[PDB]
Amino acid sequence: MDILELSERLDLQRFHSHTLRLYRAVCALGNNRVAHALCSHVDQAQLLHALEDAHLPGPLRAGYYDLLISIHLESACRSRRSMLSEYIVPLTPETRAITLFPPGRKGGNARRHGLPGVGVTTSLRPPHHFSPPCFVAALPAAGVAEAPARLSPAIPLEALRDKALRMLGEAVRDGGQHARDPVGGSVEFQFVPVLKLVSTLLVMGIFGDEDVKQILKMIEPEVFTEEDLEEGLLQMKLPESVKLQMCNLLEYFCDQELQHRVESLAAFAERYVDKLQANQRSRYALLMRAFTMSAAETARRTREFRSPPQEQINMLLHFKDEADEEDCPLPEDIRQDLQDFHQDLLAHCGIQLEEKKPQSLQELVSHMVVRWAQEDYVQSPELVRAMFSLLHRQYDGLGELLRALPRAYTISPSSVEDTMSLLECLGQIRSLLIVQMGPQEENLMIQSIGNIMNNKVFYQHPNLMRALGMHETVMEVMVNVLGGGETKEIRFPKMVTSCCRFLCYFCRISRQNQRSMFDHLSYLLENSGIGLGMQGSTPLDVAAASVIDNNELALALQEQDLEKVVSYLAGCGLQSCPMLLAKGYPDIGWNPCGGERYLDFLRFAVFVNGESVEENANVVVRLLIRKPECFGPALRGEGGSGLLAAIEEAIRISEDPARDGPRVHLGHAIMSFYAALIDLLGRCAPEMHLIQAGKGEALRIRAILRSLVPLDDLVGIISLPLQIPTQPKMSASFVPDHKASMVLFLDRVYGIENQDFLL
Amino acid sequence: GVEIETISPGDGRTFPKKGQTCVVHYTGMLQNGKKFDSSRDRNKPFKFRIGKQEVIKGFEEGAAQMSLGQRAKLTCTPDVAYGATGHPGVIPPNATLIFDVELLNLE
Amino acid sequence: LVYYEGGAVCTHARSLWRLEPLRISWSGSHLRWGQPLRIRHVTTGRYL
Amino acid sequence: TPLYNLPTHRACNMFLESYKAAWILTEDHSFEDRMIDDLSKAGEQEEEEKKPDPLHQLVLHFSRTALTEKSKLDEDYLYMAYADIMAKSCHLEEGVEVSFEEKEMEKQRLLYQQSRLHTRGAAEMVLQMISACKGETGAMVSSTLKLGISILNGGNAEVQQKMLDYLKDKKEVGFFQSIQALMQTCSVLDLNAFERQNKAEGLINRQNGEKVMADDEFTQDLFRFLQLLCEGHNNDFQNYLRTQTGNTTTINIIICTVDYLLRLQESISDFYWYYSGKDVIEEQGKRNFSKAMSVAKQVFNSLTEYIQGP
Amino acid sequence: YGESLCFVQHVASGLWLTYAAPDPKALRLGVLKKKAILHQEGHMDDALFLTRCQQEESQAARMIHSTAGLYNQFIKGLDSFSGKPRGSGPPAGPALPIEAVILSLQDLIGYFEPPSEELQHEEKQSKLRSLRNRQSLFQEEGMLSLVLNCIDRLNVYTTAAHFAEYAGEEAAESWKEIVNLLSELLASLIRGNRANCALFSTNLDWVVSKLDRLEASSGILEVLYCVLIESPEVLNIIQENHIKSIISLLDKHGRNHKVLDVLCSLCVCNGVAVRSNQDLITENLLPGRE
C-alpha cells in the first residue's frame, strides 16, 4: 500500500513510528557495522525521496530524517564535535594572512564583524573517512581482535548539502503565507527535522563559503546581507520545539567567531615575536659590542640575558601598561603596535565603549533571547537552560576567550602530519569510551595507544599534552575497567598494563606532567591491590613514578596515604596470596613476592634525592613498626624466631629443592622481601650529624631502628658467600649484587671506625 | 555453478580477458521476490574487478560469462556465496541469490 | 529473637513498637511511672 | 640561549601565556550591572501571571533544579556565572568627606538593587541551593553563600522576613544540617603543615601560602551570612537559630559557633607555643597570624549578634 | 520525646534490659546484632528515650501486617490442594478468600499509584518522595518475595478452565482477575524505584520466561520494561535466549510497539552502548524478514 495511507491507518503508523526508532537505536553510539547493514533495508533512494516528500505524516517525517542522520552523519559528527573544542593552529603563510579583521577595508575598522563562519579557519581537523556501502563483497573471515572496524556508510555529500539548503529555503518561504496546511502535522514537524540536518551538516564543515552566506541571509537578512518580504527565521512566530533548534544554529556561529579570534591572535604572535626577536638581537648587540660606556654593564645584562625565557617575556610584556612608566629596554614603535592590537581585539570581542539595529551577531542574539522570554513564559526547561547558556556567552566574550587560551597551541610546519596522526588516534580512544569494553574495542584501544606513544611528537611538546586532556582520558578508561564487581583483574587484562604503561611514559618526560598525575593519588593508591604485574605495569607502578624524584611533592604527601600502604602491606605479608597456591606453591602465612613489590613505593617516597626527608621518615618509621604483624613478623624477631634465623631455612629451601611448584618459586622472593625491608629502613635513617648531633630526635629514631636489627647478624649475612661464580645460576637465591642492601644499612646506621674495620 | 540466462541480446565479442576492471550495474534480490541490494538506488556502478575478488566468486563467474549489453539473471547457489554463515543482518544463511547484472564496460 | 541492631535500620517498620496499657477503658492517658504495659510489635503482630 | 635560537612556534606559545596573564582580565569587564539592568526593564515590550523577562524564570529555573533530589549536586557551570552576576549586581555596586546626602543615595541604591532580586524569589533560591549541598564544601555552596550575603547586605528587614517565613513554612530539615556540617569541616591554623612549607620554600613549587589554612574566604563568608541573618536585633530569627519548633530536630547553631571558636582558640594557642622562645617573627608566620585573627574577629562578631537585642 | 530518658523493667522477674555482652567473634559480622537479654545490672547505661513515628509510617506498618496475614492465608489455601487432584467435587474444606484478596489487591494498587503530572513541582516532588519512601518500606518487610510466591504458585495452572479447576471450583472467574491484579501490583511496587528494581533483577530469567504466558503478558511486559529502564545493569546479563523469547513473543502476539520499546531499552545503556545486544537484535530480528 502507499505509505501515505498511514495518515489514516493509525494502528500501523504507531508501529512504524517505533520501528524507525529501533532502526536508529540499534546502530546508535558508533557501531558502524550495523549502520552498513541497515543500508540494505532503507536504501539511499528511499531516504532521499522521503526527505523531500510533503504528504508524509508527522511522526514518520521526523523518524526518517533522524534515521538518515543516525546512519550516515552520526559517527562522523560526534567525533568532530567532541574534539572541536581544542584549537591547534599551524604557522604557515596562509595562517599569516589571517588576522582579527575588524574590517578597515572601505571604511573604519569599527565596522560590521563580517559574517562570522566564512573565514579561513585552518585548525587541524582530520577528514571523516567515509566508506561506500556494498553488499556483494567477499566478507573475509577474520578474528574479532584483528577486525579493521568499519567506517560510516557513504552518501553523496554534494547532493545532500544542495538538497538540504533547498528544503530550508522553501520552508522559510512557505512559512510566510501562514497557510492552514503545513508539510507535516504542524509547523513543528516542518521546521525541526530540516533544521536538525542543517545543524548536523554545519559542524562537519560540509557547507562551503557561499552556502554559509545563504544560511546567514536566510536566518537574518537584515544584519547578515552585505555587499515583510523574505523575512528571516527570527521574525515569524515559532513554537518551543523550533526555538530549541535555532539556539543550536547560533551556538555554532558563536563557536565559529571564537575560533576565528583565537586563531587570529595566535597568528598575530608570529608577526609580533619575529619583530621582538630581531629587536632583541639588535638591543643585545648594541649594548655588548659597545663596552666603552662602562665596565659594570652586568647590571643591564643579567636581567636580560641571565634569566629564564619566562622571565624575559613576562618582564618585557609587563611594559606598555605599568602606570605610564613602561619600565623596559624596549623601543616605542613596537610598543604602540601591541597596544593597537589590544584595542582591536577588545572592540571585536565584546566591549565597544572604548530602536537601534543590531548590525552584528553579538547584539542580534542578545536582543532575540531577551525578546523570546519576555513575550511568553517558557515552559520547556531545556530551552530555558539553552537560552541563558547562549546569552551569557555573548555578554562576556573575554571570559570565553580567556577560557579558550589554555587549550590553544601553536605548531610549526613539517610537523602537522605528525600532529595529524596523533589527533586521529586520540579520536579513536575518545570514540571507544562510550562503548562497553570488548575484545574488538580492547584490541583497537591498544593499537591506538601504541601508535600514540612513539608517533613523532609525544616527547617534543609535553605541554601540549598537559592540555587537551591526554592523560585524563586514558585514566578514565582505566577507572571504568578497574571498578568491576569487586574484581577487575580477570575483567579484560592485558589492557590495564598498557594504559598504566602510557601513564608511566607520560610522567618521565616532564615534571609538570608528573605533577599533574600526582594529584590523582587517593584513587590510585586505593586500587593498588592484587597486582599480577608479571609484565607491563601495575596500578601502583604509576603511583611510584609520580613521586620518583620531586623534593617538592614528596613533602606534600598526606598521612593517610602513607598509613594505607603499610596497613595494606601488613595484610599482604600475613597470608599466602592464594594466587600463588593455584600453581601448587607451599602454604606460608606471609607473602614473599607481594610484600617485596609493595614497599618499593615507600622506598621512593622517603629517599627523595640522595637524602632522607625527615618530614616523612619519622612518620614512616612509626607506622611501619606500629603494628607488630609487619616486616615479615614470623621470622623478624617479633614472633621470637629472629631475623638472622629467617635466611637460614630460606637457603635450605631454595638451592634447587623439589619441595615447591614451578620462575615464581619460593626462592629469591623469600629473601628479597627482607632485603628490600633492610633497604627501606636504611633510606629513612638520619643522614649525618647535621640532625644527629644537634637534635635528639634523629638519634632516637636511629636507636629504635638499631635495636630492630642488631649488628651481630649483619656480619653473619655479609660473610655468607653469594654462590659459585662458575655452571651459572639464575634468579633463584642470593644474587651476586645482593650484598648492597645490607651494606648501605651498615653505612647509614652503625659505621666502622676501628672494631669492625678488621674482620 | 551459476545460471547465465539472458534478458537482453546485447553484443558478444566483448568478453573480459583478464586484469581489466569491468563496469557493471547490479540489482540483487533474494528468494520470494525480496530485494536487499541494488546499485540503481545509489546511481553508482559497482566497478567490478577481476582477480582480486573482494566479492562473491559466484557473482564473479556470472559477470565473467557476460559481454556488452547482455543483461544476465544470475541464480547463484548458496555454495559460491556468503556460505553457511551468510552476511549478518542482511542475507540469511543458506539462500540462493538472484542478480540482474548488466555490464556497461566503461573500463 | 530481639536484636539491638541500629544505624541504617532506624527508619524502617521493624523498630516500630506500640504501648498497650492494661487500662482497657481509659487507655489514652499519659504513660505514668511504673505503669504496666503490653508492648506490641506491629509488623509481626506480636507482643514482647 | 633565552634571547635567540628559539623555534618560532615555541616563542609564540610563550607569548600566549604572558599576554594572557598580563594584558587580559586586567580591570575592564563592568557588565554585571548592565546585564540585570536590561534583564528586568524589558518585562513587557508591548504588554500579572507573566513573569519578568528571565528574572522570575531564570531564578525559578535554578530553584527547580534545587528541588530535584538526585542525592547530589551537579557542577552546573551555568549557575557559577549567574549566581556571581546576581551577587555582583549589588556587591560591585555597594551603594573622609562623605556627606549625608550622598550617603542616602548609596543606601537607597543598594536597597533598590537588592529589591530587584529578592522580589523575584532570589531569597528562596539561596535557601534551597544551600540545603541541596547537604554539607558538601565544594564551589556550589561558595557561590550560594556569596549571593546570600549581597542579597542580605546591611541587614534587610524584608529579606530576613522572607527567609524566615520560608523556613517556617516548609518545616523541612537539611538547611541546618548542611549549615552544621559546613561548620565542622572548617579548617583551623595548622603548625606541622606550616613546617612542611618552610622546608619546601628552602629548596610553581609552592602553594603561595594556601597550605596552612586555605579555608579563608569560605569560613568568613559562612559566619558572615549567619551574622547577617539576625542583624537588626531580629528577635524572631535569633530564637529560630537556637531552636526550631516546627522541625523534628533541633541543631542549635549557636553552640556550633562556640565549638568552632574553641578549636580556633586551641589552634592559635598551640601556634603561640612555637614563637615563644624566638624573639623574631618570620614573614610567613606574620601572615598566618593575620589569617587566623581576621577569621577570629568574624566569629566574635557573629556571636555578638546572637545576644544583642537581648 | 525530647531527650526524656527512661528504663524498661519486667514486672514479674524484675530484671532490666542491658547489653547482653556476648562472645565477640567475626562469624555473623554483626556490627550491632546483639541479642537483648534481661540482665541484673549490665553496665547501667542502657537507658532508652522515646520518639514518635509519623502517621504515614504507622499506617504503612499496619497495612503491612494485615496484608502479610491475608497473603499467608491465601498461600496456605493455594498449597492446601497443590497435590490433591480431587476431580469430582473440586472444592472441599476451607475456601479461598477470593473476594477479600481481590479487594485487598485493588486497594493496594490504588494506594501505590504514581502521582499525576498536572501538579506543581513542589507538591509533585513531595508526593513522589512519599511514594518512594512507602514503596521502600513495603519492599524491606518482604511484600516482594510474597507476591512472587503468590504469582508463581498461581501460574502452575495454564488452561484456566479445566486443568486449573481440577483442584478448585467457583474460582474460574477469579483466575484472570487475580493474575492481572498481581502483575499490576508487582509493576507498581517497582515502578520508579532504583533499589526495588535492583533487588528484583535477580529473577530476570523468570520474568523473561513469563512473557510467553498468553494470560499475563500485558503485566509481565510492563514489569520487564520498567526494570530495564530503571536498573540499567541487567543488559549485560541479557543472553540470546531472552532476545529470542521476546522476538517470539512479538511474533505470537502480533504487531506491537511495547515490544519495540522493550528492545530499545535492551539497546544502549545509560550512556554506554551495548554492542552485544545491538548485534543480537540486528542478526535476529531483521535478517528474518516477513
Curated annotation (Swiss-Prot), chain A:
Modified positions (Phosphoserine) are S612
Query: What post-translational events are described?
Result: The N-terminus is blocked. Channel activity is modulated by phosphorylation.
Q: Which tissues show it?
A: Detected in skeletal muscle (at protein level). Fast- or slow-twitch skeletal muscle.
Q: Spell out the subcellular localization from the entry.
A: Sarcoplasmic reticulum membrane
Disulfides per UniProt: none
Q: What is the effect of changing V435M?
A: Decreases threshold for channel activation by K(+), caffeine and 4-chloro-m-cresol. Decreases inhibition by Mg(2+)
State whether it acts alone or in a complex, and with which partners, per the record.
Answer: Homotetramer. Can also form heterotetramers with RYR2. Identified in a complex composed of RYR1, PDE4D, PKA, FKBP1A and protein phosphatase 1 (PP1). Repeated very high-level exercise decreases interaction with PDE4D and protein phosphatase 1 (PP1). Interacts with CALM; CALM with bound calcium inhibits the RYR1 channel activity. Interacts with S100A1. Interacts with FKBP1A; this stabilizes the closed conformation of the channel. Interacts with CACNA1S; interaction with CACNA1S is important for activation of the RYR1 channel. Interacts with CACNB1.
Q: What is known of its domains?
A: The calcium release channel activity resides in the C-terminal region while the remaining part of the protein constitutes the 'foot' structure spanning the junctional gap between the sarcoplasmic reticulum (SR) and the T-tubule. Pore opening is mediated via the cytoplasmic calcium-binding domains that mediate a small rotation of the channel-forming transmembrane regions that then leads to channel opening.
Biological role = Cytosolic calcium-activated calcium channel that mediates the release of Ca(2+) from the sarcoplasmic reticulum into the cytosol and thereby plays a key role in triggering muscle contraction following depolarization of T-tubules. Repeated very high-level exercise increases the open probability of the channel and leads to Ca(2+) leaking into the cytoplasm. Can also mediate the release of Ca(2+) from intracellular stores in neurons, and may thereby promote prolonged Ca(2+) signaling in the brain. Required for normal embryonic development of muscle fibers and skeletal muscle.
Give the record's family classification: Belongs to the ryanodine receptor (TC 1.A.3.1) family. RYR1 subfamily.
Q: Recite the other comments.
A: Binding of [3H]ryanodine indicates that the heterozygous channel is activated by Ca(2+) concentrations 4-fold lower than normal. Single-cell analysis of cotransfected cells shows a significantly increased resting cytoplasmic Ca(2+) level and a significantly reduced luminal Ca(2+) level.
Name of the molecule in the record: Ryanodine receptor 1
Which gene is this protein's source? RYR1
Curated annotation (Swiss-Prot), chain B:
Question: What are the EC numbers?
Answer: 5.2.1.8
Give the chief site where it resides. Answer: cytoplasm
Domain spans labelled PPIase FKBP-type: 19-107
**Which family does this protein fall into?**
Belongs to the FKBP-type PPIase family. FKBP1 subfamily.
Q: What is the enzyme's class at the highest EC level? A: isomerase
Its annotated function is as follows: Has the potential to contribute to the immunosuppressive and toxic effects of FK506 and rapamycin. PPIases accelerate the folding of proteins. It catalyzes the cis-trans isomerization of proline imidic peptide bonds in oligopeptides.
Catalytic activity line of the entry: [protein]-peptidylproline (omega=180) = [protein]-peptidylproline (omega=0)
Quote the subunit structure annotation: Identified in a complex composed of RYR2, FKBP1B, PKA catalytic subunit, PRKAR2A, AKAP6, and the protein phosphatases PP2A and PP1. Interacts directly with RYR2.
What are this entry's molecular-function GO terms?
calcium channel inhibitor activity; calcium channel regulator activity; FK506 binding; peptidyl-prolyl cis-trans isomerase activity; signaling receptor binding; transmembrane transporter binding
Instruction: Please give a single GO biological process term from the UniProt record.
Output: negative regulation of insulin secretion involved in cellular response to glucose stimulus
Q: In which tissues is it expressed?
A: Detected in heart muscle (at protein level). Isoform 1 and isoform 2 are ubiquitous with highest levels in brain and thymus.
Q: Which SUPFAM superfamilies does this one have? A: FKBP-like (SSF54534)
Q: Where in the cell is it found?
A: Cytoplasm; Sarcoplasmic reticulum
One Pfam family cited in the UniProt record for this chain: FKBP_C
InterPro entries annotated for this entry?
FKBP-type_PPIase (IPR050689), PPIase_dom_sf (IPR046357), PPIase_FKBP_dom (IPR001179)
Q: What name does this protein carry? A: Peptidyl-prolyl cis-trans isomerase FKBP1B
